[PDB]
Design a protein around this ligand. Structure first.
Ligand code: PC1
Ligand code: POV
Ligand code: 3PE
Ligand code: 3PE
Ligand code: 3PE
Ligand code: 3PE
Ligand code: 3PE
Ligand code: 3PE
Ligand code: 3PE
Ligand code: 3PE
Ligand code: 6UB
Ligand code: CA
Lengths: 289, 49, 826, 100, 48
């Protein structure tokens, strides 16, 4: 415990000022494709070793002083010294794994280091805790949005599964036939869907679907993704219009116009209600402090 | 008898009788569609066209 | 003298507001002359009341620690132009600090003076949380640089400006995903940067789910701990004929004469259906005449409205304007309805108070419009092909390559085009900034401002990336901050108007009523009953629903010949199990104590529908795709378990039901605007590639109502506004004179749409606050002290002992049950 | 025939609910009516569908018969259920499943 | 030495303009397909 002498010093503004230095060695890094680099990118892969040997002789000089084999299992009982040891263990593991293998998925943990900024400023700690203890009243709105997205995913998985795979191509080609600022829409030869109007064009199947094959209802996961995107009210009319072109004009508005009334507006009303209620609760509690 | 004597339940219990008669009417009246191939007009129904 | 300062700080704003692109030279002269003349007076009167107020106490006020800054910067800007001063980088700073004389007004309104005094110590309280927000944004920008940085190398020629290639770009992209605008196409480029719609690639979709959800949660926390805590304290700051059936008929008749306006073909005016409704209108008109002519005898606003309305009605049989001002039909049912004229009269109240905040944001919108004019004036022109930079060059034809294939070209004439939303004058800049505040199409203006080159030249890709600040600062001021104190000025018009636990828990005991339980008879009926109402039975029957939901979810498309075959027999198995549990419960509850509970009724309906669906689907191979929906709604039976979810639902649904006229106002607004737009815009042609097309038009009434719902949601409402602007093709069915078919549409559109959004944005807020205000006791309930929940516990324990209501129980059971009930009540 | 039989089933109880304090019996009755209407709606469409695989077409007399009886049976069952179901409680002490 | 800088990128072009201006060559920018034909036929002025 000979290092207890240090940690009491202003050895915390040295550390949160080299935590800010590792936030700039992340911002000035330029990401380039297919395994290319520059000179500045290769310089900052040397600064990583410096930052990695400053945030380890800062912990191994603290896990030897306060914490120990067990001694309390309380130094770790801070919620934050458990974060920094993860943030500085991943840094050694990923810094050695590449030199021994001589992974880029595992380099995406370097973006977690800005969290030591909060684990090192005390005010951020109280703000973060307050923000989280305002999330437990939302346990019933979450359990409701979840089971409503699930119901709408299962309903659209039943009425719309596999109906948006036809579109018009030019006759005898694999070129999709659109107009100036149109985006490829479904088609329905022999039905109530839209018939293709482009001149030299026919309505064939075997098309992946509207947004390069991302927006459609033909398994549970994709149905749930398009329901979520509609419930955020972004691009809900494009999905409505595509279902119109697939199967016809008169029924499918009931599915969408309701999901915007029930999932967007109604649930938002509840969320705002509960949050403001909790805020005034805490306010009238602390106005008595 | 609040649900059985109040008038707003009887207006409905009667307005459904209209649907009852027009429903037994829709089941036996064959006048609800036409064909004109092109005069040989047919009048359709559910039991016989 | 004081009223002779506002003569010169107004004649100054009008000076800097008259500035536009290509102005007549006398205007440039008049402007700089007025600037010199006004700076002279500013300094001279500053000095005059300097010696009239003395040096020391003149420096006392906050708003003259600033005035000398005006006095100094003004003349030093006069002087820097008299130097080797050069290019619009320094120059912008001169002519925009020249705008800080517009800050005088906010000191001048003297309630706007302390409005900002409150605003600034609302932020100072929350600075820590608004720092955690920026830390959040920065971590997600870096994570995006790791995930998608350098991966948008798609081989086509489509331009994807929202990428993660450097730090300022990643920062702009994360901010755009947070405002929610066009986030889905950022997600699609990120899904296609990885494989595609396949197993590893579709999991980049959780970066955007977490981003949107948690970022907007934190934003709600930020901007709701300022309208709930930091404007509740400004409160302490500031405070310290009469025949019933007859009128029911007349208001049923108003409805018929308004529904006669809905269904009318705009395109063909000579529709035999319009001929059928023309006589109907005159019948309705004679009726509405002869029963108010009779009204103006028992006496000599609402009694004069229908007076002014029936006139144009029975006159008809200008033209267009007088058939558009006949939309006053719904505006007669306000007096005939008590609650309607109660609600309408209750919102005109909350307008003359929230008018002080509507005037400060209007002046704040104007200052930013003049900044933007000084930055982006003349720089929003461009060429059809981005290779030609000036207007003399952008002439002739050029090649466009289909799908970026150099061996498939076609000729197009090149033309010098202006952006639809630009910053050339102040009115245009105010329009552009209005559309930016609704978060619609704002990245398209941002990436066109970043590219802005010079006064009459086309864009230069990624020229001025520092020009994003102007936009990100505007959105944070108006669209996030000043919008969340316009909301606070509505709560204080709601929460103001309308111990505390004591009277509310004395009311419960005073009016409460006991339950029923239907304890059975007939030891065999009691026998089955004890099984069917056992708790573990209600766990076994909630496991089978979570198992039936997975089976519906396992369906997919283009499967093979053994998944459907098992699906449709498992469906029969589940139908039979649920029918068995139904008849089981019927045997217990004796068919009379069964239909007393509404969940048992809702379950009987699901059983009867899911049986019929079986037959409809099995008759296919033995001798209506919406009956298959009675298998999914079997999942709302889970609701009966969730006590908290059910009470939350009820508590908000019941308040939606007790506030029907606030929603009637929205219905009325939609009806009026959809009738107007069907006459103003109804003859535009449905062309694909435009925003007035087969899915979105004004030709029918449902089409117009769905278009207005779309604009309320804010989808591309400014792209529809640009599709009705007089340069439009008239559809063939309509009757236009020959040669002139590009005369459809109006510039009235600009009013229409902008007045819709604003009004439709105001009422929605109004309906939200309202619904949250009559629930405030529940949403603010300290569960420690007491609550109706304990009293429902008491009702339950009372009904167990005494199932048949009957009021009374015997003293032994009475005192015995006393141990159960918790300390708060017992 | 299924629809007509549903309505037969609905009428028996919708009447038998009148005597012997059997108010409750208007809840199943109501629901049955709904289903009748429902099936009639189905009926409409299939005939419509066949009409569009067989020339000019027209729905003339009995189509409005069914498109009125179905609509009215649907709304009538739904409203009769809502009038037999007590009330959305509206107050902290009120309950669905209240005594009288 | 004639250098061509192709595409729309954010990278730095000073070095290759220098390579061109040092070794008696020339510097060209090709941002699009419609720019190709004219920029790949113009080196013959320097050679003349
Ligand atoms: C958890 C608590 C709250 C959650 C519960 C809330 C969930 C709300 C569920 C609403 C379901 C959505 C309605 C179904 C959409 C119909 C789709 C459609 O029209 O086209 C596809 C299909 C059309 O398929 P199709 O078969 O025609 O397609 C090809 C064409 N042929 C037939 C020729 C091959 O629709 C139908 O099958 C017919 C539908 C008829 C009318 C359906 C309306 C019944 C539902 C009314 C809902 C009432 C409002 C909501 C109530 C509560 C919500 C506020
Ligand atoms: C476990 C708990 C963790 C979190 C729980 C959830 C916390 C909250 C989560 C997210 C809050 C998102 C807020 C979005 C905007 C807020 C309100 C708003 O401004 O209106 C927007 C509503 O647009 C929506 O996005 C509605 C989303 C509601 C569904 C919630 C998805 C949850 C999915 C689960 C997966 C649209 O309008 P605007 O133009 O953006 O705003 C101005 C409105 N005006 C123009 C009319 C004036
Ligand atoms: C109203 C709008 C407010 C404006 C705020 C703008 C946000 C900061 C902008 C940062 C910036 O412009 O440059 C970032 C630079 C590193 O990247 P750079 O090399 O500039 O990349 C340019 C490539 N063309 O240099 C930086 O990275 C500076 C940012 C440091 C990030 C670390 C943050 C640590 C914790 C947060 C506090 C900061
Ligand atoms: C909490 C507040 C906010 C909530 C935050 C939490 C959000 C997390 C929710 C995200 C879940 C999405 C899961 C998506 C993956 C599901 C599987 C899938 O997407 O693929 C479909 C699969 C078949 O697809 P395919 O690959 O085509 O099959 C072979 C191809 N020939 O077919 C399948 O196998 C799909 C099977 C899934 C069916 C499940 C249906 C719903 C189950 C839930 C019922 C009860 C809810 C949970 C109970 C909790 C109560 C407390
Ligand atoms: C407190 C903060 C709150 C934040 C909420 C967090 C929500 C996170 C959502 C978790 C999603 C995890 C689901 C696991 C995916 C498993 C992979 C998979 O099976 O893919 C299914 C689906 C598409 O099927 P795919 O795999 O492409 O099969 C085609 C043949 N290759 O691939 C998909 O499309 C899956 C996408 C699901 C989107 C669900 C969105 C609902 C959000 C609620
Ligand atoms: C916080 C930091 C945690 C997130 C980092 C973990 C992501 C691992 C990245 C995986 C990866 O880079 O590639 C592996 C895999 C294979 O792809 P690859 O070989 O790269 O080639 C492209 C097509 N396969 O790529 C794939 O095919 C799968 C898609 C890769 C991305 C996985 C999903 C990313 C979701 C990240 C969640 C972000 C939210 C966390 C926010 C933190 C805030 C505290
Ligand atoms: C400090 C000054 C004090 C004075 C303040 C007076 C009160 C103002 C309050 C109204 C708010 C206005 C804000 C809206 C933004 C302004 C829009 C605008 O000015 O557009 C002008 C537009 C020019 O567009 P441009 O692209 O140049 O067109 C070229 C071809 N014509 O050309 C046009 O024709 C646009 C027409 C404008 C229509 C505006 C109608 C708005 C009516 C609002 C009613 C609904 C609000 C209800 C209450 C809301 C919440 C309380
Ligand atoms: C008001 C008068 C101040 C004018 C400020 C200004 O000129 O804005 C410029 C800024 C865009 O930056 P830029 O013009 O590129 O700066 C030179 C870098 N080469 O764009 C802006 O920042 C304009 C907005 C700045 C703040 C306006 C109102 C401030 C209110 C909250 C702070
Ligand atoms: C159809 C006929 C019946 C439909 C559902 C019947 C269940 C029902 O109405 O329950 C009432 C429910 C809560 O009412 P309760 O808990 O009695 O409130 C008193 C507490 N102070 O009120 C509720 O809001 C519970 C949830 C109702 C919405 C669920 C949608 C069901 C229909 C689809
Ligand atoms: C929570 C706060 C936010 C808002 C809360 C309350 C606001 C209410 C506004 C909601 C608006 C959504 C209603 C949308 C209904 C539009 C119907 C539709 O879009 O269907 C299209 C379809 C096309 O058919 P058609 O019109 O004949 O022409 C096509 C080619 N023949 O049409 C058809 O073929 C079928 C015919 C449809 C007729 C049904 C009636 C639809 C409109 C009535 C709803 C209310 C109308 C009054 C105003 C609504 C606003 C309250
Ligand atoms: C409640 C009315 O909302 C609006 O129509 C306004 C928008 C849309 O704001 C929605 C934000 N996404 N943008 C502009 C620029 C407005 C204006 O200039 O008022 C004259 C108002 C406004 C904005 C913020 C606060 C109050 C107000 Cl009345
Ligand atoms: Ca949008």
């Amino acid at each position: 415990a000979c290092i207890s002498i240090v940690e009491w010093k202003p050895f915390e503004t040295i550390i949160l000022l080299t935590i800010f230095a590792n936030c700039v060695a992340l911002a000035v890094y330029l990401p380039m494709p297919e395994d290319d680099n520059n000179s500045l990118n290769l310089g900052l892969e040397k600064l990583e070793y410096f930052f990695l040997t400053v945030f380890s002789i800062e912990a191994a000089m603290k896990i030897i002083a306060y914490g120990f084999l067990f001694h309390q299992d309380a130094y770790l009982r801070s919620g934050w010294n458990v974060l920094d040891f993860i943030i500085v263990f991943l840094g050694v593991f990923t810094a050695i794994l590449e030199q021994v293998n001589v992974v880029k998925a595992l380099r995406a943990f370097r973006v977690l280091r800005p969290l030591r900024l909060v684990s090192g400023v005390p005010s951020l700690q109280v703000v973060l805790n307050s923000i989280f203890k305002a999330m437990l009243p939302l346990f019933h709105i979450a359990l409701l949005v979840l089971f409503m997205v699930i119901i709408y995913a299962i309903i659209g998985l039943e009425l719309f599964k596999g109906k948006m795979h036809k579109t018009c191509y030019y006759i005898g080609t694999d070129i999709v036939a659109t107009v100036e600022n149109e985006k490829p829409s479904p088609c329905a030869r022999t039905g109530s869907g839209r018939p293709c109007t482009i001149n030299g064009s026919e309505c064939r199947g075997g098309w992946p679907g509207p947004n390069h094959g991302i927006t459609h209802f033909d398994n549970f996961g994709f149905s749930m993704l398009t329901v979520y995107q509609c419930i955020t009210m972004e691009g809900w009319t494009d999905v409505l219009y595509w279902v119109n072109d697939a199967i016809g004009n008169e029924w499918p508005w009931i599915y969408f116009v309701t999901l915007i009334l029930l999932g967007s507006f109604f649930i938002l009303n509840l969320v705002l209600g509960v949050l403001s209620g909790e805020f005034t609760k805490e306010r009238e509690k602390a106005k008595s402090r | 008898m609040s649900p059985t004597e109040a008038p707003k339940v009887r207006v409905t219990l009667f307005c459904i009788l209209v649907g009852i008669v027009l429903a037994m009417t829709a089941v036996v009246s064959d006048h609800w569609a036409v064909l004109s191939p092109h005069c040989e007009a047919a009048h359709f129904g559910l039991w016989r066209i | 003298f004081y009223w002779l300062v506002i003569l010169i700080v107004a004649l100054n704003t009008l000076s800097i507001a008259s500035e536009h692109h290509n102005q007549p030279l006398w205007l440039t002269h008049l402007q700089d002359i007025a600037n010199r003349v006004l700076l002279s007076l500013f300094t001279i009167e500053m000095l005059l009341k300097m010696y009239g107020l003395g040096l020391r106490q003149y420096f006392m006020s906050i708003f003259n620690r600033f005035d000398c800054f005006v006095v100094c910067s003004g003349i030093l800007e006069l002087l820097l132009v008299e130097s080797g001063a050069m290019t619009p980088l320094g120059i912008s700073v001169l002519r925009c600090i020249r705008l800080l004389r517009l800050f005088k007004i906010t000191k001048y309104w003297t309630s706007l003076s302390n409005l900002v005094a409150s605003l600034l110590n609302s932020i100072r309280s929350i600075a820590s949380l608004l720092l955690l927000l920026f830390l959040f944004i920065i971590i997600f920008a870096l994570l995006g640089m790791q995930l998608f940085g350098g991966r948008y190398d798609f081989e086509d020629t489509e331009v994807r400006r929202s990428n993660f290639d450097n730090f300022p770009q990643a920062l702009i992209s994360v901010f755009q995903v947070l405002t929610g605008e066009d986030w889905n196409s950022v997600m699609y480029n990120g899904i296609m940067a990885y494989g595609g719609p396949s197993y590893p690639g579709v999991l980049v979709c959780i970066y955007f789910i977490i981003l949107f959800v948690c970022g907007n949660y934190i934003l709600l926390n930020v901007f709701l701990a300022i309208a709930v805590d930091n404007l509740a304290e400004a409160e302490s700051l500031t405070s310290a004929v009469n025949a019933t059936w007859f009128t029911n008929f007349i208001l049923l008749f108003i409805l018929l004469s308004s529904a006669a306006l809905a269904a009318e073909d705009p395109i063909r005016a000579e529709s035999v259906r319009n001929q059928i409704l023309g006589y109907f209108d005159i019948a309705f008109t004679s009726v509405f005449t002869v029963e108010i002519v009779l009204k103006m005898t028992t006496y000599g606003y609402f009694n004069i409205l229908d007076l002014l309305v029936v006139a144009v009605s029975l006159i008809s049989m200008v033209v267009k304007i007088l058939r558009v001002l006949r939309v006053l039909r719904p505006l007669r049912a306000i007096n005939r309805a008590k609650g309607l004229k109660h609600v309408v009269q209750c919102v005109f109240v909350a307008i003359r108070t929230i008018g002080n905040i509507v005037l400060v944001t209007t002046l704040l919108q104007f200052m930013f419009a003049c900044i933007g004019v000084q930055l982006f004036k003349g720089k929003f022109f461009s060429c059809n092909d981005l290779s030609k930079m000036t207007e003399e060059e952008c002439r002739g034809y050029y090649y466009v390559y289909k799908d970026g294939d150099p061996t498939q070209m076609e000729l197009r004439p090149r033309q010098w085009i202006h952006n639809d939303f630009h910053f050339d004058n102040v009115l245009s800049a105010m329009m552009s900034l209005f559309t930016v505040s609704t978060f619609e199409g704002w990245p398209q203006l941002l990436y066109r401002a970043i590219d802005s080159n010079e006064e009459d030249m086309g864009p230069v890709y990624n020229n001025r990336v520092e020009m994003a600040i102007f936009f990100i600062i505007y959105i944070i001021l108006i669209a996030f901050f000043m919008m969340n104190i316009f909301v606070g000025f509505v709560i204080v018009t709601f929460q103001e108007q309308g111990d505390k636990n004591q009277r509310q828990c004395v009311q419960y005991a005073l009016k409460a009523r006991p339950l029923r339980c239907y304890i059975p008879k007939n030891p065999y009926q009691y026998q089955v009953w004890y099984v069917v109402t056992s708790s573990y039975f209600e766990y076994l029957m909630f496991a089978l629903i979570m198992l039936n939901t997975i089976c519906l979810g396992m369906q997919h498309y283009h499967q093979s010949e053994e998944m459907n075959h098992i699906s449709d027999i498992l469906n029969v198995a589940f139908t039979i199990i649920f029918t068995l549990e139904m008849i089981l419960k019927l045997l217990a509850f004796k068919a009379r104590g069964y239909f007393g509970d509404p969940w048992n009724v809702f379950d009987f309906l699901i059983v009867i529908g899911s049986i019929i669906d079986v037959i409809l689907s099995e008759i296919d191979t033995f001798l209506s795709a919406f009956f298959r929906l009675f298998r999914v709604m079997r999942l709302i039976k889970l609701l009966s378990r969730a006590e908290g979810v059910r009470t939350l639902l009820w508590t908000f649904i019941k308040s939606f039901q007790a506030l029907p006229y606030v929603a009637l106002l929205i219905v009325m607004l939609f009806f009026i605007y959809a009738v107007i737009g069907m006459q103003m815009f109804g003859k535009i042609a449905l062309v694909d590639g435009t925003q007035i097309n087969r899915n979105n038009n004004f030709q029918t009434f449902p089409q117009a109502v769905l278009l207005l719902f779309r604009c309320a949601t804010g989808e591309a409402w400014q792209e529809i506004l640009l599709a009705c602007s007089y340069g439009k093709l008239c559809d063939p069915e309509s009757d236009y004179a020959p040669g002139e078919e590009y005369t459809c549409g109006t510039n009235f559109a600009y009013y229409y749409f902008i007045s819709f959004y604003m009004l439709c944005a105001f009422l929605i807020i109004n309906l939200f606050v309202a619904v949250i205000m009559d629930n405030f006791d529940y949403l603010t309930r300290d569960w420690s002290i007491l609550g109706p929940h304990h009293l429902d516990e008491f009702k339950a324990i009372w009904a167990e002992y005494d199932p048949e209501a009957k009021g009374r129980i015997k003293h032994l059971d009475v005192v015995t049950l006393l141990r159960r009930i918790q300390p708060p009540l017992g | 025939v299924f629809s007509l039989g549903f309505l037969i089933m609905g009428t028996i109880c919708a009447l038998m609910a009148f005597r012997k304090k059997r108010d409750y019996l208007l809840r199943p009755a109501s629901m049955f009516y709904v289903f009748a209407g429902l099936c009639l709606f189905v009926s409409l469409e299939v005939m419509r569908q066949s009409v569009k695989r067989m020339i000019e077409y027209y729905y003339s007399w009995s189509f409005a018969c069914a498109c009125a009886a179905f609509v009215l049976l649907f709304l009538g069952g739904i409203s009769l259920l809502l009038f037999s179901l007590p009330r959305m409680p509206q107050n902290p002490w009120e309950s669905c499943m209240d005594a009288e | 030495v004639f250098t061509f800088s192709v595409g729309q990128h954010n990278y730095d072009r000073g070095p290759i303009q220098w390579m061109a201006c040092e070794n008696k060559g020339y510097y060209y920018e090709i941002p699009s397909i419609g720019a190709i034909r004219i920029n790949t036929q113009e080196y013959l002025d320097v050679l003349g």
